[PDB]
């Protein structure tokens, strides 16, 4: 068959982007945050109540006989009629292990039936609540995709992805939803992603050291690995741009001879 190559480039950042894009690549496990803690950090529901429902379970409701629709297996949260909720992150530009477009591409190439939205200040995923919690705790939180210092889950007032870190190597947050504690070195979340305070702060773990962050980040930086050091990515980008321009002008094989 065809063996995918995901991204171009031979630099370390390109390799990290390829690993994030690769669904067969096992993300390194770094933390262990229990499901209840993650659920209460998201703030959509309290751990202990049943899942709210936006439409009756797919078994109870009746649908027309659609061959092309019924041969795709739905998510477990979809057949239960669970409501669609979100988890949103802000990734610092200073060597955060995951980046907005990288996060979106990895999520769309790894998860089933998710809606990924990329932006400069934040990246958001929307899915059925049960599946959202499951994949969030399994992948987004206790893996290399999350750094408690350079990445924080913020549902509103996202600002600090491009700001300088504070004296603790920690991202700026207007709502201050997560707090660094000195006498343990751990990071504690005192509010949910929207900003509602929690009953008890939840510990997410120690921040990743900067030296480790340098070799696992997916961002090109002058101080880190630069795009000038990876000419293949630039060449591929220029080829894509030229192909787009030629196809826009005249979409024929003769026009594409000047590719």
């Amino acid at each position: 068959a065809y063996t995918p190559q995901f991204y171009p480039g031979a630099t370390k950042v390109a390799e990290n982007r390829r690993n994030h894009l690769n669904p067969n690549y096992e993300l390194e496990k770094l933390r262990e945050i229990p499901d209840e803690d993650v659920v209460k950090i998201m703030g959509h529901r309290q751990p202990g109540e049943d899942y709210k429902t936006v439409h009756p379970p797919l078994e109870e409701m009746d649908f027309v006989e659609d061959y092309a629709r019924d041969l795709v297996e739905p998510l477990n949260g979809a057949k239960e009629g669970h409501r669609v909720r979100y988890i949103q992150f802000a990734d610092s530009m200073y060597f955060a292990p995951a980046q907005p477009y990288d996060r979106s591409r990895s999520y769309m190439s790894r998860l089933r039936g998710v809606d990924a939205g990329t932006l400069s200040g934040r990246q958001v995923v929307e899915c059925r609540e049960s599946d959202l919690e499951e994949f969030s705790k399994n992948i987004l939180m206790d893996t290399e995709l999350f750094d408690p210092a350079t990445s924080g889950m913020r549902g509103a007032t996202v600002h600090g992805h491009s700001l300088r870190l504070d004296e603790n190597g920690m991202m700026f947050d207007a709502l201050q939803r997560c707090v660094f504690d000195e006498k343990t070195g751990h990071v504690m979340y005192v509010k949910d992603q929207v900003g509602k305070p929690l009953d008890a702060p939840v510990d997410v773990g120690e921040p990743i050291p900067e030296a480790k962050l340098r070799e696992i980040t997916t961002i090109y930086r002058n101080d880190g690995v630069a795009m000038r050091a990876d000419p293949d990515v630039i060449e591929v980008v220029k080829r894509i741009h030229r192909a787009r321009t030629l196809g826009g002008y005249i979409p024929t094989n003769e026009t594409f001879k000047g590719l």
Binding site: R164, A174, R242
Partner: protein, 550 residues
């Protein structure tokens, strides 16, 4: 290393611009800004007096503002600083007058009217008669009624900004006319520019009518053309006394106020339903011609950047900020293109690179030069963002970084080739290269026109093809999203600044907006925005004489 944006970063930030760390949550919130405190006091007084206890401004609700240091804003090429609130188009009278002067301008050619008067109507036309007509239209345009005391007239102090001016490419007629209300091309433009503009215009005569600002304030932009036409017809039938019949008067009316009318903007269709002389109908070449920096400066980068500033302040702040969205608006989106010398530094680097490699205009527009120039400029701008953390803090939004880098790349490509579509192609390549570099771009959709651009830059299809001078806010790709149009106008201007052209799309607009009688002088838009941010700009359209003092 020496950078043009370094001084502003030193003034704005207390720490070193290269320092990677700082401290927050110690500025007292909104109290750190004098503008916010003034707003609080004004809100208290206004609520208590006029609002009878209904709350208006409550900083305690919503986001706690001022968790970080609220930076001041320089203005490029100007040595004055202002808060970000002073640059809001509602709080800045300079931007409001910038839009007012463009809105209230209509250019009407008077050569068909003169020919109809001479031949069909049997009335001689002389420079003395032209001077008499100019006197009549100057009295009648604001609110006047000629030799009719029984007719209701507008208060003269209410329309002090209304003028009727004349210009012509005929030299002898120009020097035979009164200098009180003449736009002299010879003394307003350099010799070569004046010669080029006279050759382009021809031996024809045009009148510029500046409808009073209050008319555009009360009404919409489509009122200006009707007001101008009505006053022109009245003044024509009053100065020249004609004993012909009334059908002949209809032919003369067509020749005088519906034959050679030039409008600033066109009407918009569908959901942007608007009349003429609205900012969504102004083409990029027209806006480049409105700005007059080719008159007083020979630097191509400065000429392009003044158009960039004007286009940002119009398209992003007024048009898209309020006309299309409303609310707080998109001030910091447009100010990133004209506040600090970040875009100035990037554009100067692009010009230097093009001059060193390809010459000023030494290459025909090919794909390879577009790719290499745009890539080099984009890489330089992105590494400049990388190694100056204060710069990244200043341009916190990715949209206020992508637009700046892409504008620099497009200006560089336009310098190298002289073609505006090549410049916009370089802009789009810069955008996608930025996206791959930082794994980031602007807002959600934001790059709708940047993924569609490469294919639509050199397209030949009906709804996709247009020269960048003929494009504008009504171009289907550019209809909605912020952070592009003001830079598109600058790229279109840079396409002609490389060739040293006297104008970009319309010589008549260029001559008309060189008028010294305009309230907003388009020679230095940045300086006037700085003046307006300091509450030292005298705007028009104020109804002070028809309102109580208490």
């Amino acid at each position: 290393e020496k950078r043009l944006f370094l001084k502003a970063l030193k003034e704005k930030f207390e720490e070193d611009p290269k320092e990677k760390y700082t401290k927050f949550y110690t500025f007292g919130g909104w109290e750190q800004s004098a503008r916010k405190r003034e707003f609080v006091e004004a809100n208290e007084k206004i609520v208590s007096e006029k609002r009878q206890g209904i709350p208006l401004y409550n900083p305690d609700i919503g986001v706690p503002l001022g968790q970080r240091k609220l930076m001041p804003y320089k203005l490029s090429n100007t040595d004055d600083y202002c808060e970000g609130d002073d640059l809001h188009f509602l709080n800045n009278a300079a931007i409001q007058q910038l839009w007012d002067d463009i809105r209230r301008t209509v250019i009407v050619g008077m050569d068909t009217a003169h020919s109809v008067l001479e031949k069909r109507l049997g009335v001689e036309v002389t420079p003395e008669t032209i001077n008499e007509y100019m006197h009549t239209i100057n009295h009648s345009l604001p609110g006047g009624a000629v030799v009719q005391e029984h007719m209701v007239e507008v208060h003269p102090s209410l329309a002090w900004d209304c003028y009727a001016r004349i210009f012509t490419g005929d030299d002898e007629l120009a020097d035979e006319l009164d200098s009180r209300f003449l736009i002299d091309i010879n003394k307003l433009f350099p010799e070569e520019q004046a010669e080029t503009l006279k050759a382009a215009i021809g031996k024809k005569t045009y009148q510029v009518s500046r409808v009073p600002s209050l008319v555009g304030r009360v009404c919409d932009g489509g009122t200006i053309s009707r007001w101008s036409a009505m006053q022109i017809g009245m003044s024509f039938i009053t100065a020249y006394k004609l004993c012909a019949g009334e059908a002949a008067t209809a032919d003369f009316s067509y020749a005088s106020k519906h034959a050679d009318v030039i409008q600033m903007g066109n009407a918009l269709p569908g959901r942007r339903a608007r009349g003429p002389n609205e900012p969504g109908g102004i083409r990029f070449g027209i806006l480049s011609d409105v700005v007059q920096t080719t008159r007083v400066s020979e630097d191509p980068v400065e000429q392009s950047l003044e158009v960039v500033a004007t286009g940002a302040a119009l398209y992003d702040q007024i048009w898209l900020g309020a006309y299309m969205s409303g609310g707080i608006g998109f001030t910091q989106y447009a100010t990133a293109s004209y506040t600090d010398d970040i875009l100035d530094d990037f554009s100067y680097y692009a010009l230097d690179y093009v001059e060193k490699k390809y010459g000023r205009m030494g290459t025909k527009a090919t794909m390879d030069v577009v790719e290499d120039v745009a890539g080099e400029v984009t890489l330089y701008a992105l590494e400049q963002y990388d190694d100056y953390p204060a710069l990244l803090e200043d341009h916190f939004g990715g949209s206020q970084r992508a637009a700046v880098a892409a504008a620099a790349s497009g200006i560089g490509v336009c310098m190298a080739t002289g073609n505006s579509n090549a410049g916009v192609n370089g802009w789009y390549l810069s955008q996608i290269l930025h996206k791959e570099y930082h794994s980031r771009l602007g807002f959600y959709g934001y790059d709708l026109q940047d993924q569609c651009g490469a294919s639509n830059s050199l397209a030949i299809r009906n709804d996709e093809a247009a020269p960048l001078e003929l494009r504008g806010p009504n171009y289907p790709n550019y209809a909605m999203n912020v952070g592009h149009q003001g830079e598109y106008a600058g790229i279109a201007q840079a396409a002609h600044s490389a060739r040293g052209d006297a104008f970009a799309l319309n010589p008549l607009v260029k001559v008309a907006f060189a008028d010294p009688m305009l309230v907003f002088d388009f020679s230095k838009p940045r300086k006037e925005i700085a003046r307006g941010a300091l509450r030292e700009f005298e705007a028009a359209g104020e109804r002070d004489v028809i309102l109580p003092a208490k």
